[PDB]
Coordinates of C-alpha atoms and ligand atoms in Angstrom, one line a residue:
Chain A
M1 CA 131.6 78.3 100.2
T2 CA 133.0 76.7 103.3
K3 CA 133.5 73.1 104.5
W4 CA 130.2 72.0 106.2
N5 CA 130.8 69.5 109.1
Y6 CA 128.7 66.5 110.0
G7 CA 128.3 64.4 113.1
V8 CA 125.7 62.2 114.8
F9 CA 123.4 62.5 117.8
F10 CA 121.4 60.0 119.8
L11 CA 118.1 60.7 121.6
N12 CA 118.6 59.6 125.3
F13 CA 115.1 58.2 125.8
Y14 CA 114.0 54.7 126.5
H15 CA 110.8 54.4 124.5
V16 CA 111.0 55.0 120.7
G17 CA 108.8 53.5 118.1
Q18 CA 107.5 50.7 120.4
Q19 CA 111.0 49.2 120.4
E20 CA 112.3 47.3 123.5
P21 CA 115.3 49.2 125.0
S22 CA 117.8 46.5 124.1
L23 CA 116.7 46.7 120.4
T24 CA 117.1 50.5 120.4
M25 CA 120.5 50.1 122.2
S26 CA 121.6 47.5 119.6
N27 CA 120.6 49.7 116.7
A28 CA 122.5 52.6 118.2
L29 CA 125.7 50.5 118.6
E30 CA 125.5 49.7 114.9
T31 CA 125.5 53.4 114.1
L32 CA 128.6 53.8 116.3
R33 CA 130.2 50.8 114.5
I34 CA 129.5 52.4 111.1
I35 CA 131.0 55.8 112.2
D36 CA 134.2 54.1 113.5
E37 CA 134.8 51.5 110.8
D38 CA 132.9 52.3 107.6
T39 CA 133.1 56.1 107.2
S40 CA 135.2 59.1 108.0
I41 CA 133.0 62.2 107.9
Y42 CA 130.9 61.8 111.1
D43 CA 133.2 63.8 113.3
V44 CA 131.5 64.1 116.7
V45 CA 128.6 62.5 118.7
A46 CA 126.2 64.3 121.0
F47 CA 123.1 63.3 123.0
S48 CA 119.6 65.0 122.9
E49 CA 118.6 65.3 126.6
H50 CA 116.7 68.5 126.9
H51 CA 113.5 66.5 127.7
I52 CA 114.8 66.3 131.3
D53 CA 114.7 69.3 133.6
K54 CA 118.3 70.0 134.9
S55 CA 117.8 72.3 137.8
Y56 CA 119.3 73.0 141.2
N57 CA 117.5 73.1 144.5
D58 CA 116.9 76.9 144.3
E59 CA 115.4 76.7 140.9
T60 CA 118.5 77.9 139.1
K61 CA 119.3 75.8 136.1
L62 CA 122.3 73.9 134.8
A63 CA 123.9 76.1 132.1
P64 CA 123.2 74.4 128.7
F65 CA 126.8 73.9 127.5
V66 CA 127.4 71.0 125.1
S67 CA 130.9 70.0 124.0
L68 CA 131.4 68.7 120.4
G69 CA 134.9 67.3 120.3
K70 CA 136.8 70.3 121.8
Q71 CA 134.3 73.0 120.8
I72 CA 131.8 74.3 123.4
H73 CA 128.3 75.1 122.1
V74 CA 125.3 76.6 124.0
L75 CA 122.0 74.8 123.4
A76 CA 119.7 77.5 121.9
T77 CA 117.0 77.0 124.5
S78 CA 115.5 80.5 124.6
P79 CA 116.1 84.0 123.3
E80 CA 117.7 84.9 126.7
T81 CA 120.1 82.0 126.5
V82 CA 121.1 82.9 123.0
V83 CA 122.0 86.4 124.1
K84 CA 124.3 84.9 126.8
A85 CA 126.0 82.9 124.1
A86 CA 126.3 86.0 121.9
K87 CA 128.1 87.9 124.8
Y88 CA 131.0 85.6 124.3
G89 CA 130.7 84.9 120.6
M90 CA 130.0 81.1 121.4
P91 CA 128.4 78.9 118.8
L92 CA 124.8 77.6 119.3
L93 CA 123.4 74.2 119.1
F94 CA 119.9 74.2 117.5
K95 CA 117.3 71.7 118.7
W96 CA 115.7 69.3 116.2
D97 CA 112.4 69.6 118.1
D98 CA 112.2 73.4 117.5
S99 CA 110.3 74.3 114.2
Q100 CA 112.6 75.7 111.4
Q101 CA 110.8 79.1 112.0
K102 CA 111.8 79.1 115.7
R103 CA 115.4 78.3 114.8
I104 CA 115.5 81.2 112.3
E105 CA 114.1 83.5 115.0
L106 CA 116.7 82.4 117.5
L107 CA 119.7 82.7 115.1
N108 CA 118.6 86.3 114.2
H109 CA 118.1 87.2 117.9
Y110 CA 121.7 85.9 118.4
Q111 CA 123.0 88.0 115.5
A112 CA 121.2 91.1 116.9
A113 CA 122.8 90.6 120.3
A114 CA 126.3 90.2 119.0
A115 CA 125.8 93.4 116.9
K116 CA 124.6 95.2 120.0
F117 CA 127.6 94.0 122.1
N118 CA 129.9 94.6 119.2
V119 CA 131.1 90.9 119.2
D120 CA 132.6 89.7 115.9
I121 CA 130.9 86.4 115.0
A122 CA 132.0 86.4 111.4
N123 CA 133.7 83.0 111.8
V124 CA 131.2 81.3 114.1
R125 CA 129.5 78.2 112.8
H126 CA 126.6 76.7 114.7
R127 CA 125.4 73.1 114.8
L128 CA 121.9 72.0 113.8
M129 CA 120.4 68.7 115.1
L130 CA 118.2 66.9 112.5
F131 CA 116.4 63.6 112.5
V132 CA 117.1 61.9 109.1
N133 CA 115.0 59.0 107.7
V134 CA 115.8 58.2 104.0
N135 CA 113.5 55.7 102.2
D136 CA 113.0 55.2 98.4
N137 CA 109.3 55.3 99.3
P138 CA 108.8 58.8 100.7
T139 CA 105.6 57.9 102.6
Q140 CA 107.5 55.1 104.5
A141 CA 110.3 57.4 105.7
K142 CA 107.7 59.7 107.2
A143 CA 105.7 57.0 108.8
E144 CA 108.8 55.6 110.4
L145 CA 109.9 58.9 111.8
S146 CA 106.4 59.5 113.1
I147 CA 106.1 56.2 114.9
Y148 CA 109.6 56.6 116.4
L149 CA 108.8 60.0 117.9
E150 CA 105.3 59.4 119.2
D151 CA 106.1 58.6 122.9
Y152 CA 108.7 61.4 123.1
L153 CA 106.3 64.1 121.8
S154 CA 103.7 62.8 124.2
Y155 CA 106.2 62.8 127.1
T156 CA 107.3 66.3 126.3
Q157 CA 103.7 67.5 125.8
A158 CA 105.0 69.2 122.6
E159 CA 102.8 71.9 121.1
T160 CA 104.4 71.3 117.7
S161 CA 102.5 68.9 115.4
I162 CA 104.4 65.9 114.2
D163 CA 103.8 67.5 110.8
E164 CA 105.9 70.5 111.7
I165 CA 108.4 68.3 113.3
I166 CA 108.7 66.3 110.2
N167 CA 108.9 69.4 108.0
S168 CA 111.6 70.7 110.2
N169 CA 113.7 67.5 110.0
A170 CA 114.4 65.3 106.9
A171 CA 112.2 62.3 106.0
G172 CA 111.9 61.2 102.3
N173 CA 114.0 59.9 99.4
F174 CA 117.7 60.8 99.3
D175 CA 117.5 63.6 96.7
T176 CA 114.6 65.2 98.5
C177 CA 116.5 65.2 101.9
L178 CA 119.7 66.6 100.3
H179 CA 117.8 69.5 98.9
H180 CA 115.5 70.0 101.9
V181 CA 118.5 70.1 104.3
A182 CA 120.4 72.6 102.0
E183 CA 117.3 74.7 102.1
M184 CA 117.1 74.7 105.9
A185 CA 120.8 75.6 106.0
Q186 CA 120.1 78.6 103.7
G187 CA 117.3 79.6 106.1
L188 CA 120.0 79.7 108.7
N189 CA 122.4 81.9 106.6
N190 CA 124.5 78.8 105.7
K191 CA 126.1 79.2 109.2
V192 CA 125.2 75.7 110.4
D193 CA 127.2 72.4 110.6
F194 CA 125.0 69.4 111.4
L195 CA 124.3 66.5 113.8
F196 CA 122.1 63.8 112.3
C197 CA 120.0 61.2 114.2
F198 CA 119.4 58.1 112.0
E199 CA 117.7 56.0 114.7
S200 CA 114.3 56.1 113.2
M201 CA 115.5 54.0 110.2
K202 CA 114.3 50.5 111.1
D203 CA 116.4 48.7 108.5
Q204 CA 120.0 48.6 109.6
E205 CA 121.3 47.8 106.1
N206 CA 119.5 50.8 104.7
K207 CA 120.9 53.0 107.5
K208 CA 124.5 51.6 106.7
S209 CA 124.1 52.1 103.0
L210 CA 122.8 55.7 103.5
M211 CA 125.7 56.6 105.8
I212 CA 128.3 55.2 103.5
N213 CA 126.8 56.8 100.3
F214 CA 126.7 60.2 102.0
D215 CA 130.2 59.8 103.3
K216 CA 131.5 59.3 99.8
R217 CA 129.5 62.1 98.2
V218 CA 130.8 64.6 100.9
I219 CA 134.4 63.5 100.3
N220 CA 134.0 64.1 96.6
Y221 CA 132.3 67.4 97.1
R222 CA 135.0 68.7 99.4
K223 CA 137.7 67.7 96.8
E224 CA 135.8 69.2 93.9
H225 CA 135.4 72.5 95.7
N226 CA 138.8 72.7 97.4
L227 CA 137.0 72.5 100.7
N228 CA 139.5 70.1 102.4
Chain B
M1 CA 153.1 50.6 127.0
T2 CA 150.4 52.4 125.1
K3 CA 149.6 55.9 124.2
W4 CA 147.8 57.6 127.1
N5 CA 145.2 60.2 126.0
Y6 CA 144.5 63.5 127.7
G7 CA 141.6 66.0 127.6
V8 CA 139.9 68.6 129.8
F9 CA 136.7 68.9 131.8
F10 CA 134.8 71.7 133.3
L11 CA 132.6 71.6 136.4
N12 CA 129.2 72.9 135.4
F13 CA 128.5 74.7 138.7
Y14 CA 128.1 78.4 139.4
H15 CA 129.8 78.8 142.8
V16 CA 133.5 77.9 143.0
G17 CA 136.1 79.4 145.3
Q18 CA 133.9 82.5 146.1
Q19 CA 134.4 83.6 142.4
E20 CA 131.7 85.6 140.7
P21 CA 130.3 83.6 137.8
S22 CA 131.7 85.9 135.1
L23 CA 135.2 85.4 136.5
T24 CA 134.8 81.6 136.5
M25 CA 133.5 81.9 132.9
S26 CA 136.4 84.1 131.8
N27 CA 138.9 81.7 133.4
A28 CA 137.3 78.8 131.6
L29 CA 137.5 80.6 128.2
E30 CA 141.2 81.0 128.7
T31 CA 141.5 77.2 129.2
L32 CA 139.6 76.7 125.9
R33 CA 141.9 79.3 124.2
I34 CA 145.0 77.5 125.4
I35 CA 143.7 74.1 124.1
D36 CA 142.8 75.6 120.7
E37 CA 145.8 77.8 120.1
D38 CA 148.7 76.9 122.4
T39 CA 148.8 73.1 122.6
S40 CA 147.8 69.9 120.8
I41 CA 147.4 67.1 123.3
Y42 CA 144.1 68.0 124.9
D43 CA 141.8 66.0 122.6
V44 CA 138.3 66.3 124.0
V45 CA 136.3 68.4 126.5
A46 CA 133.6 67.1 128.8
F47 CA 131.4 68.6 131.6
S48 CA 131.0 67.3 135.2
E49 CA 127.3 67.5 135.9
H50 CA 126.4 64.5 138.1
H51 CA 125.6 66.9 141.0
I52 CA 122.2 67.4 139.3
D53 CA 119.5 64.6 139.4
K54 CA 118.5 63.7 135.9
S55 CA 115.3 61.7 136.3
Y56 CA 112.0 61.2 134.4
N57 CA 108.6 61.6 135.9
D58 CA 108.3 57.9 136.9
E59 CA 111.6 58.0 138.8
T60 CA 113.5 56.2 136.0
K61 CA 116.8 57.9 135.3
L62 CA 118.5 59.4 132.2
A63 CA 121.1 56.8 131.1
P64 CA 124.6 58.1 132.0
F65 CA 126.2 58.2 128.6
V66 CA 128.9 60.7 127.8
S67 CA 130.4 61.2 124.4
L68 CA 134.1 62.1 124.2
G69 CA 134.8 63.1 120.6
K70 CA 133.2 60.1 118.8
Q71 CA 133.6 57.6 121.7
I72 CA 130.7 56.8 124.1
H73 CA 131.5 56.3 127.7
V74 CA 129.2 55.3 130.6
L75 CA 129.7 57.4 133.8
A76 CA 130.7 54.8 136.5
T77 CA 127.9 55.8 138.8
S78 CA 127.3 52.6 140.7
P79 CA 128.3 48.9 140.6
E80 CA 125.0 48.1 138.7
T81 CA 125.6 50.8 136.0
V82 CA 129.1 49.5 135.5
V83 CA 127.7 46.0 134.9
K84 CA 125.4 47.5 132.2
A85 CA 128.4 49.0 130.5
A86 CA 130.3 45.7 130.8
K87 CA 127.4 43.9 128.9
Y88 CA 128.4 45.8 125.8
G89 CA 132.1 46.2 126.4
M90 CA 131.7 50.0 126.7
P91 CA 134.4 52.2 128.3
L92 CA 133.7 53.9 131.7
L93 CA 134.2 57.4 132.8
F94 CA 135.4 57.6 136.4
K95 CA 134.3 60.5 138.6
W96 CA 136.9 62.8 140.2
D97 CA 134.6 63.0 143.3
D98 CA 134.8 59.3 144.0
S99 CA 137.8 58.3 146.2
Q100 CA 140.6 56.3 144.4
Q101 CA 139.5 53.3 146.5
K102 CA 136.0 53.4 145.1
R103 CA 137.2 53.8 141.5
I104 CA 139.4 50.7 141.9
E105 CA 136.4 48.8 143.3
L106 CA 134.3 49.9 140.3
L107 CA 136.8 49.0 137.7
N108 CA 137.3 45.5 139.2
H109 CA 133.5 45.0 139.4
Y110 CA 133.4 45.9 135.7
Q111 CA 136.2 43.4 134.9
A112 CA 134.3 40.7 136.9
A113 CA 131.1 41.4 134.9
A114 CA 132.8 41.2 131.5
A115 CA 134.5 37.9 132.5
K116 CA 131.1 36.6 133.6
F117 CA 129.4 37.6 130.3
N118 CA 132.4 36.5 128.3
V119 CA 132.9 40.0 126.8
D120 CA 136.5 40.8 125.5
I121 CA 137.5 44.1 127.0
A122 CA 141.2 43.7 126.2
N123 CA 141.3 46.8 124.2
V124 CA 139.0 49.0 126.3
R125 CA 140.5 52.2 127.8
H126 CA 138.5 54.1 130.3
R127 CA 138.7 57.8 131.2
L128 CA 139.5 59.2 134.6
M129 CA 138.5 62.8 135.6
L130 CA 141.0 64.5 137.9
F131 CA 141.2 68.0 139.3
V132 CA 144.8 69.2 138.8
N133 CA 146.3 72.2 140.8
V134 CA 150.1 72.5 140.3
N135 CA 152.0 75.1 142.4
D136 CA 155.8 75.2 143.3
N137 CA 154.6 75.6 146.9
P138 CA 152.7 72.4 147.6
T139 CA 150.6 73.8 150.4
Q140 CA 149.2 76.6 148.1
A141 CA 148.1 74.1 145.5
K142 CA 146.1 72.2 148.1
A143 CA 144.6 75.3 149.7
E144 CA 143.5 76.5 146.2
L145 CA 141.8 73.3 145.4
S146 CA 140.1 73.2 148.8
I147 CA 138.7 76.7 148.5
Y148 CA 137.5 76.0 144.9
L149 CA 135.5 72.9 145.9
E150 CA 134.0 74.0 149.2
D151 CA 130.5 75.1 147.9
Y152 CA 130.2 72.0 145.6
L153 CA 131.0 69.5 148.4
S154 CA 128.5 71.3 150.6
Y155 CA 125.9 71.3 147.9
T156 CA 126.4 67.6 147.2
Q157 CA 126.5 66.8 150.9
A158 CA 129.6 64.7 150.1
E159 CA 130.5 62.1 152.7
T160 CA 134.1 62.2 151.4
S161 CA 136.4 64.5 153.3
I162 CA 138.1 67.1 151.2
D163 CA 141.3 65.4 152.3
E164 CA 140.3 62.3 150.5
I165 CA 139.1 64.2 147.6
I166 CA 142.5 66.0 147.5
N167 CA 144.4 62.7 147.8
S168 CA 142.3 61.2 145.0
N169 CA 143.0 64.2 142.7
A170 CA 146.3 66.0 142.0
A171 CA 147.4 69.1 144.1
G172 CA 151.1 69.8 144.6
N173 CA 154.3 70.7 142.7
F174 CA 154.7 69.4 139.1
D175 CA 156.9 66.4 139.8
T176 CA 154.7 65.2 142.7
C177 CA 151.5 65.4 140.5
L178 CA 153.2 63.5 137.6
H179 CA 154.1 60.6 139.9
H180 CA 150.9 60.7 141.9
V181 CA 148.8 60.5 138.7
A182 CA 151.0 57.7 137.3
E183 CA 150.4 55.9 140.6
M184 CA 146.6 56.3 140.4
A185 CA 146.7 55.0 136.8
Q186 CA 148.6 51.9 138.1
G187 CA 145.9 51.4 140.7
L188 CA 143.5 51.3 137.7
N189 CA 145.6 48.7 135.8
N190 CA 147.0 51.4 133.4
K191 CA 143.6 51.2 131.6
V192 CA 142.8 54.9 132.0
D193 CA 143.1 57.9 129.7
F194 CA 142.4 61.3 131.4
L195 CA 140.3 64.4 131.6
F196 CA 141.9 67.2 133.7
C197 CA 140.1 70.1 135.3
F198 CA 142.5 73.1 135.8
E199 CA 139.9 75.6 137.0
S200 CA 141.2 75.7 140.6
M201 CA 144.5 77.3 139.5
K202 CA 143.8 81.0 140.3
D203 CA 146.8 82.3 138.3
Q204 CA 146.0 82.2 134.6
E205 CA 149.6 82.4 133.6
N206 CA 150.6 79.5 135.8
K207 CA 147.7 77.5 134.3
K208 CA 148.9 78.4 130.8
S209 CA 152.6 77.6 131.5
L210 CA 151.6 74.2 133.1
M211 CA 149.4 73.2 130.1
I212 CA 152.1 74.1 127.6
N213 CA 154.9 72.4 129.6
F214 CA 152.9 69.2 129.9
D215 CA 151.9 69.3 126.2
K216 CA 155.6 69.4 125.2
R217 CA 156.7 66.6 127.7
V218 CA 153.9 64.3 126.4
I219 CA 154.9 64.9 122.7
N220 CA 158.5 64.0 123.6
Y221 CA 157.5 60.9 125.5
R222 CA 155.3 59.6 122.7
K223 CA 158.2 60.1 120.3
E224 CA 160.8 58.5 122.5
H225 CA 158.6 55.4 123.1
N226 CA 157.2 55.1 119.6
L227 CA 153.7 55.8 121.0
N228 CA 152.5 58.1 118.1
Ligands
LIG1 C1 122.8 60.8 105.3 C2 122.3 62.2 105.2 C3 121.3 62.6 104.2 C4 120.7 64.0 104.6 C5 121.2 65.1 103.7 C6 122.1 66.1 104.4 C7 122.5 67.2 103.4 C8 123.6 68.1 103.8 C9 123.7 69.4 103.2 C10 124.0 69.3 101.7 C11 125.4 69.0 101.3 C12 125.6 69.2 99.8 C13 127.0 69.0 99.4 C14 127.5 67.6 99.4 O1 127.0 66.8 98.5 O2 128.4 67.2 100.2 C15 125.1 70.6 99.3 C16 123.9 70.6 98.6 C17 123.1 69.3 98.4 C18 123.4 71.8 98.1 C19 122.1 71.8 97.3 C20 124.1 73.0 98.3 C21 125.3 73.0 99.0 C22 125.8 71.8 99.6 N1 126.9 71.8 100.4 C23 127.6 72.9 100.6 C24 128.8 72.9 101.4 O3 129.3 71.9 102.0 N2 129.5 74.0 101.5 C25 129.0 75.2 101.0 O4 129.6 76.2 101.2 N3 127.9 75.3 100.2 C26 127.1 74.1 100.1 N4 126.1 74.1 99.3 C27 125.7 75.4 98.5 C28 124.9 76.2 99.5 O5 123.5 75.9 99.4 C29 125.0 77.7 99.2 O6 124.6 77.8 97.8 C30 126.5 78.2 99.3 O7 127.0 78.0 100.6 C31 126.5 79.7 99.0 O8 128.0 80.1 98.9 P1 128.4 81.4 98.2 O9 128.0 81.5 96.9 O10 130.0 81.4 98.4 O11 127.7 82.5 98.9
LIG2 C1 133.7 77.4 128.2 C2 132.5 77.0 129.1 C3 132.9 76.4 130.4 C4 131.9 76.5 131.5 C5 132.3 76.7 132.9 C6 131.2 76.8 133.9 C7 130.9 78.3 134.2 C8 129.7 78.7 134.9 C9 129.4 80.2 134.9 C10 128.6 80.7 133.8 C11 128.2 82.2 133.8 C12 127.4 82.8 132.7 C13 126.9 84.2 133.1 C14 127.6 85.2 132.4 O1 127.0 86.2 131.8 O2 128.9 85.1 132.3 C15 126.2 81.9 132.2 C16 126.2 81.5 131.0 C17 127.2 81.7 129.9 C18 125.0 80.7 130.5 C19 124.9 80.2 129.1 C20 124.0 80.5 131.4 C21 124.1 80.9 132.7 C22 125.2 81.6 133.1 N1 125.3 82.0 134.4 C23 124.4 81.8 135.3 C24 124.5 82.2 136.7 O3 125.5 82.8 137.1 N2 123.5 81.9 137.5 C25 122.3 81.3 137.1 O4 121.5 81.1 137.9 N3 122.2 80.9 135.8 C26 123.1 81.1 134.9 N4 123.1 80.7 133.7 C27 121.9 79.9 133.3 C28 120.9 80.8 132.5 O5 120.6 81.9 133.4 C29 119.6 80.0 132.2 O6 119.0 79.7 133.4 C30 120.0 78.7 131.5 O7 120.7 79.1 130.3 C31 118.7 77.9 131.1 O8 117.9 78.9 130.2 P1 116.5 78.6 129.5 O9 116.2 77.2 129.6 O10 116.8 79.1 128.1 O11 115.5 79.3 130.3
LIG3 C1 149.2 69.3 133.5 C2 149.1 68.0 134.1 C3 149.9 67.6 135.2 C4 149.4 66.4 135.9 C5 150.2 65.1 135.6 C6 149.5 64.1 134.8 C7 150.4 62.8 134.6 C8 149.9 61.9 133.5 C9 150.4 60.5 133.6 C10 151.9 60.5 133.5 C11 152.5 60.5 132.1 C12 154.0 60.1 132.0 C13 154.5 60.2 130.6 C14 154.7 61.6 130.1 O1 155.6 62.3 130.6 O2 154.1 61.9 129.1 C15 154.2 58.8 132.7 C16 154.8 58.9 134.0 C17 155.1 60.2 134.7 C18 155.2 57.7 134.7 C19 155.8 57.7 136.0 C20 154.9 56.5 134.0 C21 154.3 56.4 132.8 C22 153.9 57.6 132.1 N1 153.3 57.6 131.0 C23 153.0 56.4 130.4 C24 152.3 56.4 129.1 O3 151.9 57.4 128.5 N2 152.1 55.2 128.5 C25 152.5 54.0 129.2 O4 152.2 53.0 128.6 N3 153.1 54.0 130.3 C26 153.3 55.2 131.0 N4 154.0 55.2 132.1 C27 154.6 54.0 132.7 C28 153.4 53.3 133.5 O5 153.5 53.8 134.8 C29 153.6 51.8 133.5 O6 155.0 51.6 134.1 C30 153.6 51.2 132.1 O7 152.3 51.5 131.4 C31 153.7 49.7 132.3 O8 153.9 49.0 130.8 P1 154.5 47.7 130.6 O9 155.7 47.5 131.2 O10 154.4 47.5 129.1 O11 153.6 46.7 131.4
LIG4 C1 125.7 54.0 122.0 C2 124.8 54.6 123.0 C3 123.5 55.3 122.4 C4 122.4 55.4 123.3 C5 121.0 55.4 122.8 C6 119.9 55.4 123.8 C7 119.4 54.0 124.2 C8 118.6 53.8 125.4 C9 118.4 52.3 125.8 C10 119.4 51.8 126.8 C11 119.1 50.4 127.3 C12 120.1 49.8 128.3 C13 119.5 48.5 128.8 C14 120.2 47.3 128.3 O1 120.6 46.4 129.1 O2 120.4 47.3 127.1 C15 120.6 50.7 129.4 C16 121.9 51.1 129.5 C17 123.0 50.6 128.6 C18 122.3 51.9 130.7 C19 123.7 52.3 130.9 C20 121.3 52.4 131.5 C21 120.0 52.0 131.4 C22 119.6 51.2 130.3 N1 118.3 50.9 130.1 C23 117.3 51.3 130.9 C24 116.0 51.0 130.7 O3 115.6 50.4 129.7 N2 115.1 51.5 131.6 C25 115.5 52.3 132.7 O4 114.6 52.7 133.4 N3 116.8 52.6 132.9 C26 117.7 52.1 132.1 N4 119.0 52.4 132.3 C27 119.3 53.3 133.4 C28 119.9 52.4 134.6 O5 118.9 51.5 134.9 C29 120.2 53.4 135.8 O6 118.9 53.8 136.3 C30 121.1 54.5 135.4 O7 122.3 53.9 134.8 C31 121.4 55.4 136.6 O8 122.2 54.4 137.6 P1 122.7 54.8 139.0 O9 122.7 56.2 139.1 O10 124.1 54.2 138.9 O11 121.8 54.3 140.0

């Protein structure tokens, strides 16, 4: 057992769930407010911005480094990129928009690389980005996540299937999400810390209540298991 | 008096001071190593990546948000962007590649905006990115910084003058840099925390020694002034 770390991410995209930009902005500021004043477990913030091509004039690409606090992660963008991270034993950052199956393929490819280069990654913990929508009515959590993501999936011309996206993220009641996320972590050898995106939750009070309930549960768990 | 915060940044660019990429990479990992094991003041890490255009298909641009730890900053890319940050009282991130004169214009434009919107920014602290090259021989610090930046300035087709860039950053002996940086902060109303880029220092031991000496000096200062 080890202490699992949590954080938050924001999707840097202007059109989500037919919301006007200033509404999306306002919702995001509330999330920030909750992290700063209402809770203590949300350690770092990151942005999802891989929908934009970041290339130089000669077609070489910006290196996909992401800092989380003082820790540098490499966005797991392709099997080749994960091998470059393995060369230095650097932690990965898994995309929320990759299916769980793809994430697992990528982590194992990384593990194969390290073994091949003889790099000790025993202590490396990666980060997994997940969209989280918790609703007492499971159907409503899913509908909300779906509506939120429609323009982005359309923009990115995703092959995916919103179904898969949903299955690879966390939409449902609290208990279902807890378990589903633990399952996904297991799928990734329990080597992943997390970044959650709560922006699909339309109700700000529900978002607040969820973030605070989870904060308290994690603090208790850490204490109970001598994880702090 | 207030506690000034420090961090580090890396320039996400492959060609610096005629170094092969793996050498630049290796130097950067040493910086990370020093921050994690040898010191405690370097709080956050960021990347300089504004040399790449980040636009959508319709010519709209990615919003220039940067997270530092759990704090969201807006890159001060233009007077209009700074007004958008002022609307919400968000902190700015000043570019190392803007002359000091331009930074001062931008901060005051931000302050004018906030006053106009009646937004209280009393408590806001911004972050300033600076390249730091400390050498007992002042001439050598400058030459090193100049050689390091030549390809980047050329790529960005900077209007600037490496001279100005140098004057707006910190190259020289330790005491000169301490004072020069304090001066720049004063120019920005003492409302700036910092991000330093040490990558132009060719000698890894000198880089290490500098980072550790500064760490100790800051800890003492904080204690002496009841800043912690
Ligand atoms: C607002 C967010 C809602 C979305 C939900 C996100 C869920 C986050 C992951 C779950 C955290 C649980 C702990 C907690 O309540 O804080 C949790 C759960 C629900 C489950 C089923 C298993 C967990 C777990 N948390 C763990 C943790 O922090 N550290 C661990 O080491 N293990 C955790 N586990 C057990 C895990 O599934 C594995 O069984 C063990 O890691 C295996 O260890 P071993 O026996 O030593 O090999
Ligand atoms: C602690 C981190 C600080 C970073 C400081 C900036 C240093 C830049 C030099 C990086 C050199 C690496 C090469 C090596 O083996 O050492 C490197 C790395 C680690 C990564 C992740 C990507 C790199 C890369 N070097 C490149 C280079 O010299 N020239 C390139 O043209 N591209 C390089 N890349 C990018 C990589 O080749 C891929 O194009 C991107 O990862 C995008 O991949 P995709 O989308 O998955 O296809
Ligand atoms: C490896 C890096 C080398 C590059 C050098 C970076 C320099 C960083 C800025 C300087 C930090 C000094 C403190 C320290 O040693 O840790 C410092 C210096 C050198 C000077 C000349 C003035 C400083 C100062 N640090 C300050 C700080 O942390 N907090 C403050 O509030 N004030 C500092 N000052 C004084 C400042 O110039 C102003 O006089 C006061 O802020 C004015 O306050 P007021 O009277 O209450 O209005
Ligand atoms: C706590 C932060 C979490 C972020 C979550 C993502 C939210 C995205 C919505 C942002 C809406 C803003 C508009 C408003 O007044 O509320 C906003 C902001 C704050 C900023 C900094 C830039 C924005 C922007 N909204 C835009 C929009 O709706 N449509 C656009 O096409 N562009 C927007 N921009 C970008 C801005 O207009 C500039 O193009 C960029 O700042 C680049 O500027 P330049 O390089 O300085 O020219």
